[PDB]
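Submission sheet (multi-component)
Chains listed below:
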Amino acid sequence: SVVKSFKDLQLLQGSKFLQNLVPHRSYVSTMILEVVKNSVHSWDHVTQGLVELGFILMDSYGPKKVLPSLSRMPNQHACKLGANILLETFKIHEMIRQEILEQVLNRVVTRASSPISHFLDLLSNIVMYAPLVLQNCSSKVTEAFDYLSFLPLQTVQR
Amino acid sequence: EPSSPQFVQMLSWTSKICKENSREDALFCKSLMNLLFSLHVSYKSPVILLRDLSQDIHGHLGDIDQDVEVEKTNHFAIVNLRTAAPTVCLLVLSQAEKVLEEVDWLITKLKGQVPNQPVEKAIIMQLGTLLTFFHELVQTALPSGSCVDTLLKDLCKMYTTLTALVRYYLQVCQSSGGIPKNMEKLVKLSGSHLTPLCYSFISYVQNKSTKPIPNLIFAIEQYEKFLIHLSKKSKVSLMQHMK
DNA sequence: AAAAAAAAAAAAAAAAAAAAAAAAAA
DNA sequence: TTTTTTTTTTTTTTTTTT
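Outcome: structure written.
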């Protein structure tokens, strides 16, 4: 339901003839990012499923072809919807830090053969956003320092 | 920005270069036509430009029956015997494939829908203009490279879109009751103009001496079968328009 | 008034895309 | 003689059937 939405949006944006007919529909991307805003109050039931959708979108649609439009642009846009789900979910839900942050790190550290640039982007965003909110969930970082020797060099620099 | 006057200035300049300068070198014509199309399709539907370019291809290449004297060189100057035969045909058929994908998306959303009337009016307008476009190309003699099988595949896509359209008409005809008149002219044009010359083109490609031609004949017979069911369940005889 | 092989998991087939090789032109 | 393009092949992914 997310990949179909991005295919539809790419098809309309590439052609004016379809822009004249079809009146501007909300897409599943904007609806999901509304769910993450809505869930702040009491909806903790929702947010453990937001985290699983985030990492299913990133895990399934991340790059591999560099280690084209149709294999690239509705898969680039889903994988960057994933990171947006997890970064907006990380900011407001003060209890699924250490469930995103130990799972981002667990994909950066252990995979290291498949391309993982998207997780380093997400980890950069998560850190850079607030290291003030990461000093309450910091030991998940310093347990991946002990695995730094065995990584390839570019992953260590990154 | 695609609504700016500088967009229209760039589109007019590109079109003027396309209307004057010949330049017999395939890569230059291909990249310049791609620039023109890329500008055009973000402004308005390209079907007029596709129609004129098919007329140029028909005028340069000729006909299958070798007794049709047609020359329409006035339209677009970047059309040559060494340019329009290998390279321009693939580009105009690829853009036509894109327009067929767009109307397929519209047809599928119109099936799922049951905002109603102008949508289907624009759909049958694009299909009519593309029908005249395809009518101009089916009579021509293309080289036996990728061009002929690309024409068969895109004609299969054309007939598939027509089949899906009359399928939506089969879905909708019970609630309202009746066929709009523009659809009647469209099915007259598809029966009279396209399909006999499609048969003649199959004979033309077959006589000169394996998968696309069975696909195409299956597509056209499924079109005729769904048209039988529509002409029964619509209280109108659309086979007197057909041959 | 006529139409279908869909029947939780797995396997096979088809399609598409990417890479490699070969041929041609300067 | 080299570089680019085109054509073919192989691999991977998705869908449909048992």
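Remark: The longest helix of chain A spans residues 73-92.
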